[PDB]
Design a protein around this ligand. Structure first.
Ligand SMILES: CCc1ccccc1NC(=O)CSc1nc2cccnc2[nH]1
Ligand SMILES: CCc1ccccc1NC(=O)CSc1nc2cccnc2[nH]1
Lengths: 122, 122
């Protein structure tokens, strides 16, 4: 595998599947569901890790497709099924754009996230 | 009430209690617990709302005191009890600092959040 999945027309979100998830539409999260993910985020430019839920030993929950998180995450996680692990490359358009965010993410940064979809629920 | 609670020595985190929460230490979240909050965040400078879980009609979960969220939120929520509603003023040191974050939060922004602690759990 290492299937590469193009998720936006502009090339700004491209997912590489590292471990395939479970089969079926019943194993795919729906818009508005709560998802639980583990992730590691690094800058493409330097390879430097700026955030990791794995380092914290506890995953992160959000509601899918609601704009609670960066656009790249909504788009990426919507494409995943339970237990899938992927690495997603996000152009700055799908991250923090021209401004960046705080000390660890410069403006116009391409972000690389390893994301694992642990579970989801209503 | 409208009790004002100073939470850092530098004045960078100051909470005003709008509705007092439940009594007891058993109604106070512990470091590492999951908390569920509703919030509305606005810039002090303009009054402009940059993020609201209430607009989304679904609250937000994070693990308390783990640096998953801005420092101001860890500090503020640690001081709350179940059902408390507060408004917290955060100096940029406790938000997104000199750089800001994305289009909606400029560098050196004081942030004002209304936060309600809905529940928490192990
Ligand atoms: C943590 C999940 C979350 C909830 C609500 C809003 C945004 C986020 N994080 C991300 O969207 C992307 S992950 C991330 N984005 C970051 C920006 C600066 C520093 N560290 C960061 N880590
Ligand atoms: C959403 C909760 C969350 C989870 C993980 C990491 C950060 C956050 N948000 C906050 O810390 C403060 S809330 C917030 N911070 C923001 C920065 C830019 C735009 N909107 C924002 N809303």
């Amino acid at each position: 595998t290492l299937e590469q999945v193009h998720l936006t027309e502009d090339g700004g979100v491209v997912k590489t599947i590292l471990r395939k998830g479970e089969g079926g539409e019943e194993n795919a999260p729906k818009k508005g569901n709560e998802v639980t993910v583990h992730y590691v985020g690094k800058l493409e430019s330097s390879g430097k890790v700026f955030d990791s839920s794995r380092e914290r030993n506890v995953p992160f929950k959000f509601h899918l497709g609601q704009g609670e998180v960066i656009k790249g995450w909504d788009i990426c996680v919507a494409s995943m099924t339970k237990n899938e692990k992927c690495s997603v490359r996000l152009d700055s358009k799908y991250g923090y754009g021209e401004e960046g965010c705080g000390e660890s993410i410069p403006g116009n940064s391409v972000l690389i996230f390893e994301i694992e979809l642990i579970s989801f629920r209503e």
